Amino acid sequence: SVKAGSAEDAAFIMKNASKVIIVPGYGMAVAQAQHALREMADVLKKEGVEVSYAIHPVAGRMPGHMNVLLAEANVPYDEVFELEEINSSFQTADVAFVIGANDVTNPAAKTDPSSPIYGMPILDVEKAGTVLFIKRSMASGYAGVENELFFRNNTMMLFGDAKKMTEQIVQAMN
Template sequence: MLQNNLLIVAGMLVGAAGLILTQIMCKAMNRSLGNVLFAKFGEDGGGGGGSDEYTGVTSTTAEELAPLLEAAGKVLIVPGYGLAVAQAQHKCRELGDLLEKEGAEVAYAIHPVAGRMPGHMNVLLAEADVEYDKLFDLDQINGEFSQTDVTIVLGANDVCNPAAIRDPESAIAGMPVLNVWESQTVVVIKRSLSAGYAGIKNELFEADNALMFFADAKKALEDLVTEMKEL
């Protein structure tokens, strides 16, 4: 087998691709390779982010959100692992199209490590035929949140946790994140208040301008589309 040059070259290409993806992931998390491989991420981050750690969380429903979205002039959508698990990319695109018909400007904010690997969200949204020029990475989109009426966080957690910027003792301190909290209103679609990969509390969920929509991503989007069509 080792004498098969094609297999050797193929193995080298696979290894090189894996190394490149790993480097992208480490840069996006502001972590060294050794830290990613061997450190216990979030071990001193202040707990696991269970519901008992949160106070002042404001929950909402599709019926309440529909008028808010209908009136929005600019909407940013932040997809995360929850979107992938629910296979909600097509419903996400449907909601985006509906918002545009209502006159809103819609774009998608993609964090480099959202999902299982770099580029995961790009692939899912491309599968749903979301136009590529509507996808923006962290560096391109972060300046837009302060000018956004509504940001919808779809199953993302650590990649939009303000502790990365505000708390130097946090397990994710220094990690580049999407500044979604700068939006006028943030709608977080998530099944529960459970922690993300870092295992820490997300202060975003308690923010004054944050609304928590507790539901599976696909079901939540289906309900939002239905409610908006009935307005």
């Protein structure tokens, strides 16, 4: 019933990875963590790690919501990818840093035909080595439904605010 984690943890998980792809969502924007994320990334690919962004079409609360924020923080266009031209890369990825996402990764979209989020395509974060969720609590997202991916083998719960929590994860990663 849910595994939790801390800044140092995540710092470790991601620091010793080959491929890590970010997954910004409405959370990442409520906390205005564009830059903190842009940092954790350039000093992740500084070690040598492989970084990319998985922008899901309805991420956030408006069309292009993650796009404007990432752009404000200067994340190179060629690092940002759309749900389709990248969903196949999670399989061969060590970590899926889900900073602010939730409903966008919920597998109940492919499964439980009883759900409100049924049918909507999603990024394959579950098909990744290890998941790294971030969120102030255990509340649901827009849809208002628990994301089962929340508690399972490689799913972490780095509870807290996205800007702070990403700011610390940057810190303990020098």
